[PDB]
Write a protein that binds this DNA or RNA. Structure first.
Length: 114
RNA sequence: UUUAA
């Protein structure tokens, strides 16, 4: 087809939306955190993980039945190098009567022995 | 002690 007008930018700035929502980086750049106390939150686990690299997204899990924290969360990086560093940086971290567990997100690349 | 809420 022929050329056409670009109709200009949608907002001349950041895209408007009802939420910032979650998003992920490349493979191996995603991270998990568990054993968190209830004082954690999406911004709190974010500030805990931002010095390890550029975090694209961060969230602490919540129960829709009680609105209490599920004591674990999810985080993601723009590269796997900052992700694997953040595992060795927060895994085994003592808080309260427990130590924080940290791990990579599940993937179909690991769902098989091949 | 764990994978979208």
């Amino acid at each position: 087809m022929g050329s056409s007008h670009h109709h200009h930018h949608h907002s001349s700035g950041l895209v408007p939306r009802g939420s910032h929502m979650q998003k992920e980086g490349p493979e191996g750049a995603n991270l998990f955190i568990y054993h968190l106390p209830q004082e954690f939150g999406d911004q709190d686990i974010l500030q805990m993980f931002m010095p390890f690299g550029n975090v694209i997204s961060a969230k602490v899990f919540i129960d829709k039945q009680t609105n209490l924290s599920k004591c674990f969360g999810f985080v993601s990086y723009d590269n796997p190098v900052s992700a694997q560093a953040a595992i060795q940086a927060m895994n085994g971290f003592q808080i309260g009567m427990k130590r924080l567990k940290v791990q990579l997100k599940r993937s179909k690349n690991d769902s098989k022995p091949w």
